Design an enzyme around this catalytic site. Structure first.
Site, mmCIF file in Angstrom:
data_model
loop_
_atom_site.group_PDB
_atom_site.id
_atom_site.type_symbol
_atom_site.label_atom_id
_atom_site.label_comp_id
_atom_site.label_asym_id
_atom_site.label_seq_id
_atom_site.Cartn_x
_atom_site.Cartn_y
_atom_site.Cartn_z
ATOM 1 N N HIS A 1 0.807 -1.216 0.000
ATOM 2 C CA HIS A 1 0.000 0.000 0.000
ATOM 3 C C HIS A 1 0.841 1.267 0.000
ATOM 4 O O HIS A 1 0.368 2.309 -0.471
ATOM 5 C CB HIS A 1 -0.941 0.004 1.207
ATOM 6 C CG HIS A 1 -0.232 0.055 2.523
ATOM 7 N ND1 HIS A 1 0.320 -1.060 3.115
ATOM 8 C CD2 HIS A 1 0.018 1.090 3.363
ATOM 9 C CE1 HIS A 1 0.878 -0.716 4.263
ATOM 10 N NE2 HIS A 1 0.708 0.582 4.438
ATOM 11 N N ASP B 1 1.515 -9.505 2.208
ATOM 12 C CA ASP B 1 1.635 -8.042 2.113
ATOM 13 C C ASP B 1 3.100 -7.601 2.148
ATOM 14 O O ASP B 1 3.481 -6.698 2.896
ATOM 15 C CB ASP B 1 0.805 -7.351 3.207
ATOM 16 C CG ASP B 1 0.525 -5.880 2.917
ATOM 17 O OD1 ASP B 1 0.974 -5.366 1.874
ATOM 18 O OD2 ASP B 1 -0.149 -5.236 3.751
ATOM 19 N N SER C 1 4.601 3.351 8.558
ATOM 20 C CA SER C 1 4.446 1.947 8.208
ATOM 21 C C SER C 1 5.785 1.390 7.744
ATOM 22 O O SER C 1 6.453 1.993 6.896
ATOM 23 C CB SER C 1 3.391 1.766 7.115
ATOM 24 O OG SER C 1 3.265 0.403 6.747
#
Lengths: 163, 49
Positions: free
Chosen positions: A40, A62, A114
């Site tokens: 992302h 991910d 993140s």
């Protein structure tokens, strides 16, 4: 106090931010000759060597991973699987490891932090922060970690928001 | 006499139809069983978490 200074001294050269038109939205990780980077978070790698590569993808776990060359494998993070419960070091202070779950007290946590690895009292990466969910007063983390067998386990609580 | 549907199929062609129609089903059900076993093996290996 000194814990944030130790995080800044350990993660000085090995942590590279991800730029997107001047905005810092994520952080990659260079450990074990591998370059971990989430899905992302989209942007260009600030490092010139790590940007001109090809990252194999894993959308279920991910994670994008690549092969760090041999002239940089010594200057990586450390990693281990032996972890007890209790306290660990994080970039904004401390993080609690209880019942196999990482919890962070509130006040901190936004969009952009993140990919920050979780360190211990010795200097080894035990988890990689990917997401977080607000639980009452004390938020929980959606992270990845390893085990004794060698299987990358992705822990994800209910209704998490990606950072 | 009467013209029955599939009256002149000549057993060799039953064997060709049964091979080309049954081997595909065998391969797809062993693929589905292999997918289920792989999913259970992933859930077993992630249990140690």
């Amino acid at each position: 106090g000194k814990r944030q200074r130790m995080v800044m001294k350990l993660e000085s050269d090995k942590t590279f931010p991800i730029m997107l038109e001047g905005k810092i939205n994520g952080y990659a990780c260079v450990v074990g000759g591998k370059l971990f980077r989430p899905m992302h978070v989209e942007g260009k790698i600030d490092n010139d060597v790590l940007a001109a590569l090809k990252t194999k993808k894993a959308s279920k776990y991910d994670l994008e991973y690549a092969d760090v060359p041999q002239n940089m494998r010594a200057d990586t993070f450390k990693y281990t699987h032996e972890k007890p419960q209790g306290y660990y070091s994080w970039h904004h202070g401390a993080v609690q490891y209880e019942n196999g779950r990482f919890t962070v007290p509130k006040g901190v946590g936004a969009k952009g932090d993140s990919g920050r690895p979780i360190l211990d009292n010795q200097g080894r990466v035990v988890a990689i922060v990917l997401g977080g969910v607000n639980e009452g007063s004390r938020t929980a983390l959606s992270v990845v970690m390893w085990n004794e067998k060698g299987v990358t386990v992705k822990y994800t609580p209910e209704n998490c928001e990606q950072w | 006499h009467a013209q029955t549907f599939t009256a002149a199929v000549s057993k060799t062609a039953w064997t060709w139809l049964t091979s080309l129609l049954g081997g595909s089903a065998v391969i797809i059900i062993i693929g589905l069983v292999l997918a289920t076993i792989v999913a259970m093996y992933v859930l077993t290996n992630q249990k140690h978490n």
